[PDB]
Amino acid sequence: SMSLQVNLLNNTFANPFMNAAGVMCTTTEELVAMTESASGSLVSKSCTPALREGNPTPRYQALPLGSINSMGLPNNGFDFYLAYAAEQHDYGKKPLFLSMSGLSMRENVEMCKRLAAVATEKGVILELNLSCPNVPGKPQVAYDFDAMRQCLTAVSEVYPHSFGVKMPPYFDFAHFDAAAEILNEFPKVQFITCINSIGNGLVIDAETESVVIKPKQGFGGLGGRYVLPTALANINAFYRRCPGKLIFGCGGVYTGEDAFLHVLAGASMVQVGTALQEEGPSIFERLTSELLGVMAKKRYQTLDEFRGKVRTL
Amino acid sequence: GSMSLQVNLLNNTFANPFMNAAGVMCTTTEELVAMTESASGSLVSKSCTPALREGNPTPRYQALPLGSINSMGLPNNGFDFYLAYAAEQHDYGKKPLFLSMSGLSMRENVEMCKRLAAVATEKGVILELNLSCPNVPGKPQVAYDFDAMRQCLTAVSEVYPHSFGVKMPPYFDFAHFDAAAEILNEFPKVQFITCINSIGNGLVIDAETESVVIKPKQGFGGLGGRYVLPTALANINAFYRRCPGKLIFGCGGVYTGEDAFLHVLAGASMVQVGTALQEEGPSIFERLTSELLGVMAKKRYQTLDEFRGKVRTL
Ligand SMILES: Cc1cc2nc3c(=O)[nH]c(=O)nc-3n(C[C@H](O)[C@H](O)[C@H](O)COP(=O)(O)O)c2cc1C
Ligand SMILES: Cc1cc2nc3c(=O)[nH]c(=O)nc-3n(C[C@H](O)[C@H](O)[C@H](O)COP(=O)(O)O)c2cc1C
C-alpha cells in the first residue's frame, strides 16, 4: 500500500504536485481548473499591487528541450488574487499558495499587511517571489544579497505568519552559502522554492536567423529539460544548508521519474511549469500515476522513505 | 559559388573557426599532436597551473543524453610542459596555437605570464586566461567576484606585453553582463572573450542507482553540451553587443554545423567544441567543417563575416 501524502505547514496534501507560479494560474477559470485537478496544491500567479499587462508578444516559446519566456509579470493584480483566497477558493479540496511579486519593498510591505488577515482566517500561504526585477542597474532581487536581506527583514517585520521564498538558481558554492546564511536568519521563512527559470538565455531559430521572443532582444528565462540538473543542485544545496526549512522543487518536471529525482534531492512539494503549460491540468493525473509507478517498482511506500536520501560517492 | 570558413584575427589566419574547448582532448603531447593534425582551425592547450596537478578523484566526468557533467579539478601537466610544447614542438605551419592558463592566485598567473611573454613574441602562441577559476575560500569563482577579476586583469596586463583573451563563466542577468563588460572594456589587451565555461554546479542524479554520478563535491559539477546552448548564445551575444572593441569566441553546446552557425549569428569569431569532441574525438572537425559549409550553402552565404553577429531581433 502506497501514499503520496505530504504533511507540512499545518496542512495535509494528497500528493506533492502543484503548478509553478505563473503557469496556468492567472484567471478565475485557471484557478478553478487547478483546484479541480488531481494536483496536491496550487499557487496563484505572481502578483503586483495593481493589474499589469506584461511584455509585448511573442513572449513565450515552447522548445524541444523546454521553453523560453519573458512574460513581464502579466497578472490581474493583488486585489483579485486576495479575493480568490478570501472568498472563492475551496480549501476543502486543497491548500492554496499565493505568489507575491511586488516591484519594491514598499509594494510587498503594503500587500503583506492586507494578506495577513486572509492568511489568518482562511489559511492561504504566501510564496514571496524574490526572483523578481530590481531597480535599474541592479540584478534580480535574490542576486543582490543586500536587497534580498532588506526584503526579508521588511516582510518579516510586517507579516505575522510563516511564508516561503521563490529563488533563482545559483551556480557557485559561495553563493549557496551566502544565500543560505541570509535565509537562515529569518525563522518565518519556512520553505524555499528552488528554482525559478535559468535567467536570460537566448534562443535563436536557425531557419529564421532570428530570436524567438520580442522583449529584451530575445533574452528570456529557460525552463523545462534545460534546467533539471540546475534545479536538483539548488534543491539539494538548500536542503543541506537550511535544515530547519522545507524545500519545494521547481524545474524540469515532465514525468513521475523527474519528480522522484526532485524528492531524492530533498523536495517536499514538486511544482510543474513548462510541462503543465504544454499539457494542461490533466497532467497531474498522469504525474501522480507515474510517481506511484516509480515508487512501486523501487519498493517505496511513502515519500518520507527517500526524501533527501540521494547517495553521494 | 566559392565559400570560405576563413577567420582573420590577432595577426593570424585560421582555415576555419573550429577548435577544441580548453580542458578537452588537449592535456598530453599525444592529444596536442592529434588536435594539430585534425581538420580544426586551431587548438588550445589544457588550462595549466605552475606545477602539475592530479585533479579530483574519479569518477569526475559523466557523459549524458543532453550533455555532460564534470568536476575535473584542473588535472594538467603544469606550465613548463605547455610552454615547451608552444616553444619547441608545435607546428605553427599547420595552425595557430592558444595556451590556456589557470593559476590559482594573481602571483601564479603573473609569474607564468612573465615567462610566456618571450614565447608569445618568438613563436606566436596566444594566451587564453581562464578567469572562470577557483577563488580563495569563501569566495565565488574569480569572474563572479568583480573586484578579484579587475585585480587579476590589472596584474596580468602590467607584466604581459601582448594581447590575450579571457575565458568567462556564464552570467544570467543584464546587470551582470553590464558590470562584466565594463571591467573587460577597461583592458584593451583583452582582445577576445570566450563565452562560456560550463554552467556551474549542476547536480545529476541517476534514478536507477538513486545516486549522484561524479565523486567530487557531493556530485555537483559543471554542465556542458545540449543543456548549455541557449546560455552560451546569450553570453556570446551579450558581450558581442557590450564589447564592440573585442572579438567573441563561442563555447558551449556545439554538436553540429547548425549549432556553430548559431554561435556565429550570435557574434562568435571562433567556435570551441567540448562535450561533443570528448564523445567523438578529433575526427569531429571534418564533420563540423562540412556541415557548416552545407548550412552556409543552403542559406546562400559565402563567408562568416556576412552573418556574424547579425541575429535578427523582433
Ligand atoms: C510562462 C511562464 C510564466 C511564469 N511566471 C512566473 C511567476 O509569475 N512567478 C514565478 O515565481 N515564476 C514564474 N515562472 C517560472 C516557473 O514558476 C518555474 O520556476 C520555471 O518555469 C521552471 O520550471 P519548469 O522547468 O517546470 O518550467 C514562469 C514560467 C513560465 C514559463
Ligand atoms: C572534462 C572537461 C574539462 C574541462 N577543462 C577545462 C579547462 O581546463 N579550462 C577551461 O577553461 N574550461 C574547461 N572546460 C569547459 C569547456 O572548455 C567548455 O567551456 C564547456 O565544456 C562547455 O562547452 P561544451 O558544451 O562544448 O562542452 C572543461 C569541460 C569539460 C567537460
Ligand SMILES: *C(=S)Nc1ccccc1
Ligand atoms: C522586497 S520585500 N521587495 C523588492 C525590493 C527591490 C526590488 C523589488 C522588490
Ligand SMILES: *C(=S)Nc1ccccc1
Ligand atoms: C588573477 S590574475 N588570478 C587569480 C586571483 C584569485 C584567484 C585565482 C586566480
